[PDB]
C-alpha cells in the first residue's frame, strides 16, 4: 500500500523542481533555436492564419526566470504521470525474481 | 532431430514408400516373359530404386511425417552436403564462366571491328581466355584491389 497524496506530491514537486532549476536553460535555448512553426520562411500567423496568432496574455510571467503557466502545466502533468506510474507499480502485486 | 525430423533410416514411411514402389514395379513385371527385354529393363529399374533408397538412408538425411527427405540450409555442420558444398561448387563454376566471358569482352573491345568478333567468336583467343579461368577468384580479388574492376564515368540520363 502506497500513500497517494504523498507520492503524487513528491513526484510533482521533483518534476517541478527539475523544470524550474535544472533543465530550464536547456529547454529555453532549445525552444529559442526551434523558434516557431514556419512555412515558406514566414510564420503561420504572418502567413495569414488568423487562428494561429500566439496568445501572450496567457504567457505573461513574473518569475525572475520567466517561468510560465504553460510550463507549470507541462511539468505538473509529467509529475502527476510519474506519481501514478510509481503508485501503480508499487500496488501492481507483480514481483518477478530476476 | 532438427525441427522434429527423424532420420530416413529410422523413419517408417520411407520404408513404406520403398515397399510400395517395389510392389508396383513387380506388379508391372508380372505381365512379361522372364528372359525378355522388358523384364530386364524392369529389373534394372528395381535395382536402381533399391540402390537409391539405400544411399538416401545411409547418407544421413532427415525425414518428415509424410516419409520424404527434407533439407537443412541454416549452416548446420551435419548437413553441409545438402546446401553448402553444392553451393560452393556452383559459385566456383558460375564465377568461372562469368569471369572468362568478361575477360573475352574486354579483350575484344580493342579491335578493328568489335561487333564482328561479337557475333563470330575468335576461337583461339576464346580458348586461351577459357583455360585461364581456373584461378578466377584470385584474379577477381586482384582487380578489385587494383581498382581495375569498376568504372566511374558512365552514361546516365537526366536526373
Amino acid at each position: 500500500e502506497a500513500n497517494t497524496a504523498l507520492t503524487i506530491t513528491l513526484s510533482t514537486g521533483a518534476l517541478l523542481f527539475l523544470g524550474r532549476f535544472v533543465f530550464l536553460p536547456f529547454q529555453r535555448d532549445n525552444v529559442s533555436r526551434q523558434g516557431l512553426p514556419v512555412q515558406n520562411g514566414v510564420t503561420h500567423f504572418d502567413a495569414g492564419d488568423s487562428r494561429a496568432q500566439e496568445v501572450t496574455s496567457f504567457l505573461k510571467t513574473n518569475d525572475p526566470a520567466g517561468f510560465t503557466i504553460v510550463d507549470v502545466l507541462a511539468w505538473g502533468a509529467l509529475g502527476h504521470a510519474v506519481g501514478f506510474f510509481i503508485l501503480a507499480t508499487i500496488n501492481n502485486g507483480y514481483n518477478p525474481q530476476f | 532431430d532438427v525441427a522434429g525430423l527423424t532420420p530416413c533410416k529410422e523413419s517408417k514411411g520411407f520404408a513404406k514408400r520403398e515397399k510400395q514402389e517395389i510392389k508396383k514395379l513387380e506388379s508391372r513385371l508380372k505381365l512379361y516373359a522372364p528372359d525378355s527385354a522388358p523384364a530386364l529393363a524392369l529389373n534394372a529399374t528395381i535395382e536402381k530404386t533399391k540402390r537409391r533408397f539405400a544411399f538416401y538412408g545411409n547418407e544421413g538425411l532427415l525425414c518428415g511425417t509424410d516419409g520424404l527427405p527434407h533439407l537443412i540450409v541454416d549452416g548446420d555442420q551435419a548437413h553441409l552436403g545438402e546446401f553448402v558444398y553444392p553451393g560452393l561448387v556452383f559459385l566456383y563454376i558460375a564465377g568461372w564462366i562469368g569471369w572468362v566471358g568478361r575477360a573475352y569482352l574486354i579483350d575484344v573491345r580493342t579491335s578493328k571491328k568489335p561487333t564482328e568478333k561479337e557475333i563470330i567468336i575468335d576461337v583461339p583467343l576464346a580458348l586461351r581466355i577459357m583455360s585461364k579461368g581456373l584461378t578466377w577468384p584470385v584474379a577477381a580479388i586482384g582487380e578489385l584491389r587494383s581498382g581495375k574492376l569498376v568504372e566511374k564515368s558512365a552514361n546516365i540520363t537526366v536526373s
Binding site: - | K132, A139, G142, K148
Partner: protein, 205 residues
Amino acid sequence: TDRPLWLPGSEAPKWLDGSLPGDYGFDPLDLAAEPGRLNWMVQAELVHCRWAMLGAAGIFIPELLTKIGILNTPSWYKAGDATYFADQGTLFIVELLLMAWAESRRWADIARPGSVNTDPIFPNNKLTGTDVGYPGGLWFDPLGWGSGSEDKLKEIRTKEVKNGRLAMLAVLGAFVQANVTHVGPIDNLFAHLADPYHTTILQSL
C-alpha cells in the same frame, strides 16, 4: 644466356625477366601480370617454401626414425589427438598471439621495407638485412652465410627455393596419401618398392 624454361620452345612472359631465383618463366595463368603482385607472390612463395620444408622435416624424418626403431613417435596424421601438458585450444590461442606478433612485424617490413629493422625495446639491436624476405641479422642469420655478392646470392637462394618447392609437393603428397591410404608415407614407399606394378595410385579404384 637464355635460361632453361619450364616448357622448351616457349617464351617467358614479360614480367618474368630472369632476375629472381628459381625463375623458369612459369606463369601460364598470368597471376603476377599486374606490376604490384610480383613482390607479394615472391614473399608468399618464400614463406610457403620455408613452412613446407619445416613440415617435411617434421613429417618424414620422425616417421623414418620410428620405422627404424630409434624413436617411438606416433603417426603424424594422428599426433594432434594426443595428451600434452597443455590443452590443444590453449596451445592454438598461444600460437595465434605469438604468430600475430611475428607476422605483424613481417607485414610491417613487407609494406614499408627497412622500417622494423630495430628492436622495439632495446634500440641497439638493429637487424642487418637488405632484401625483403631475407631478414638477416644475428637472430636469423647467425653463421653469416647468405650475405655476399650479387649473382652469388643467386645460387644459394635458388637452392633454397627449389628445395622448398620440392618440399611443398612432398607435403601435399603426404597429405593426400595419408587421406587415401590410411598408412604413413614410409610404408607406402616400401609398398611401391616391393610390388611396383600393383601398388600404385590406381589400386582397385
